[PDB]
Design an enzyme around this catalytic site. Structure first.
Site, PDB file in Angstrom:
ATOM      1  N   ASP A  81       0.785  -1.153   0.078  1.00  0.00           N
ATOM      2  CA  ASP A  81      -0.033   0.161  -0.068  1.00  0.00           C
ATOM      3  C   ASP A  81       0.850   1.181  -0.058  1.00  0.00           C
ATOM      4  O   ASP A  81       0.648   2.201   0.948  1.00  0.00           O
ATOM      5  CB  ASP A  81      -0.907  -0.237   1.089  1.00  0.00           C
ATOM      6  CG  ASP A  81      -2.088   1.059   1.086  1.00  0.00           C
ATOM      7  OD1 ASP A  81      -2.667   1.007   2.255  1.00  0.00           O
ATOM      8  OD2 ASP A  81      -2.349   1.654  -0.006  1.00  0.00           O
ATOM      9  N   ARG A 119      -0.837   8.968   0.666  1.00  0.00           N
ATOM     10  CA  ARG A 119      -1.648   8.910   1.657  1.00  0.00           C
ATOM     11  C   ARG A 119      -1.032   8.277   3.076  1.00  0.00           C
ATOM     12  O   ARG A 119      -1.455   8.595   4.217  1.00  0.00           O
ATOM     13  CB  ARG A 119      -2.991   8.392   1.403  1.00  0.00           C
ATOM     14  CG  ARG A 119      -2.872   6.573   1.052  1.00  0.00           C
ATOM     15  CD  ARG A 119      -4.292   5.914   0.959  1.00  0.00           C
ATOM     16  NE  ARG A 119      -3.899   4.827   0.127  1.00  0.00           N
ATOM     17  CZ  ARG A 119      -3.920   4.598  -0.974  1.00  0.00           C
ATOM     18  NH1 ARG A 119      -4.460   5.566  -1.912  1.00  0.00           N
ATOM     19  NH2 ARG A 119      -3.669   3.621  -1.598  1.00  0.00           N
ATOM     20  N   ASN A 120       0.208   7.512   2.717  1.00  0.00           N
ATOM     21  CA  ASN A 120       0.488   6.742   3.826  1.00  0.00           C
ATOM     22  C   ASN A 120       2.076   7.078   4.002  1.00  0.00           C
ATOM     23  O   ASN A 120       2.758   6.424   4.785  1.00  0.00           O
ATOM     24  CB  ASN A 120       0.717   5.158   3.493  1.00  0.00           C
ATOM     25  CG  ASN A 120      -0.541   4.498   3.472  1.00  0.00           C
ATOM     26  OD1 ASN A 120      -1.576   5.012   3.904  1.00  0.00           O
ATOM     27  ND2 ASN A 120      -0.952   3.693   2.313  1.00  0.00           N
ATOM     28  N   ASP A 174       1.618   4.032   7.686  1.00  0.00           N
ATOM     29  CA  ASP A 174       0.703   3.085   7.912  1.00  0.00           C
ATOM     30  C   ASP A 174       1.281   1.605   8.491  1.00  0.00           C
ATOM     31  O   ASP A 174       1.211   1.727   9.558  1.00  0.00           O
ATOM     32  CB  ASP A 174       0.192   2.470   6.695  1.00  0.00           C
ATOM     33  CG  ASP A 174      -1.465   2.341   6.590  1.00  0.00           C
ATOM     34  OD1 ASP A 174      -2.161   2.681   7.632  1.00  0.00           O
ATOM     35  OD2 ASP A 174      -1.871   1.532   5.649  1.00  0.00           O
TER      36      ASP A 174
END
Ligand SMILES: CN1c2ccc(-c3ccc(C(=O)N4CCC(CCO)CC4)cc3)cc2-c2[nH]ncc2S1(=O)=O
Length: 254
Positions: free
Chosen positions: A132, A136-137, A150
């Site tokens: 992932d 965003r992480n 994350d």
């Protein structure tokens, strides 16, 4: 071992929302008197099934020690259950890049990509597949330091992940290409206005995310190497790290 006595933590303001509950900044008093920390809370950790899953992030993070991966400081395992992490003071990468679209120089953007590649070469050497990788992480510790946080996003995923649920360090490399694109786009998401179901078709037609405005062609080329359809033809993270170092040094010289 990393169980923290609650009286050593002063809970501060809510700085974000997490999967299990609000995230706060706070202060940790240890034998450093005032260390700024992030505190992940858990609304439903009164149920052990939720507690077990929540505290898994901490167990996972404990195995890593890298300058560009968020560090676990400790946990409090009785209600209210908390995970204590180093604070990345400048918050989420996407928001950071958006408000500094016209004030971060290109060298800083490339530096963030380089730093992430060092974290990911480290994870690859630990035989750890992330699954992932996306802006965003990523969190921002300082204007010159980002960290991977994350531990389905179709628009970030490698074709083999989409088609066959294959996840390897080579599929992480595809995702990292997308993350680099995001950074050079100042926190714009990939494939805006495109339906998830249509992504694989465009990829299979040979289409790729375009060169970001003002992105050095050498760097866009590196992104495109990450997006080889055949995973075996993608660079390893250690190669990305080496090439990004060169691109960074060249930009610093402008
Ligand atoms: C997901 N996590 C976090 C989420 C938000 C923020 C966060 C959000 C906002 C701010 C914040 O106060 N601002 C205000 C000023 C802004 C500077 C202007 O660009 C930065 C955002 C700081 C940290 C920090 C973290 C974090 N740090 N270390 C671990 C974690 S986490 O729990 O894994």
């Amino acid at each position: 071992d990393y169980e923290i006595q609650r009286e050593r933590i002063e809970l501060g303001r809510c700085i974000g929302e997490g999967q299990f509950g609000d995230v706060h900044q706070g202060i940790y008093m240890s034998p450093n008197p005032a260390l700024a920390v992030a505190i992940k809370t858990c609304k439903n950790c009164t149920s052990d099934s939720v507690r077990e899953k929540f505290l898994q992030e901490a167990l996972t993070m404990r195995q890593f020690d890298h300058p560009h991966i968020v560090k676990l400081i400790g946990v409090i395992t009785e209600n209210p259950v908390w995970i204590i992490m180093e604070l990345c003071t400048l918050g989420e990468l996407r928001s950071f890049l958006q408000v500094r679209k016209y004030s971060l120089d290109l060298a800083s953007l490339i530096l963030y990509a380089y730093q992430l590649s060092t974290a990911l070469a480290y994870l690859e050497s630990k035989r750890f597949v992330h699954r992932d990788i996306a802006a965003r992480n990523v969190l921002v510790s300082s204007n010159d330091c980002v960290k991977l946080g994350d531990f389905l996003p179709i628009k970030w995923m490698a074709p083999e992940s989409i088609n066959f649920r294959r996840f390897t360090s080579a599929s992480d490399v595809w995702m990292f290409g997308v993350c680099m694109w995001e950074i050079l786009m100042h926190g714009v998401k990939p494939f805006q206005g495109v339906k998830n179901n249509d992504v694989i078709g465009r990829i299979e037609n040979g289409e790729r995310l375009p060169m970001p405005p003002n992105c050095p062609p050498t760097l866009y080329s590196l992104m495109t190497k990450c997006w080889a359809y055949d995973p075996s033809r993608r660079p390893r993270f250690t190669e990305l790290k080496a090439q990004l170092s060169t691109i960074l040094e060249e930009e610093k010289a402008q």
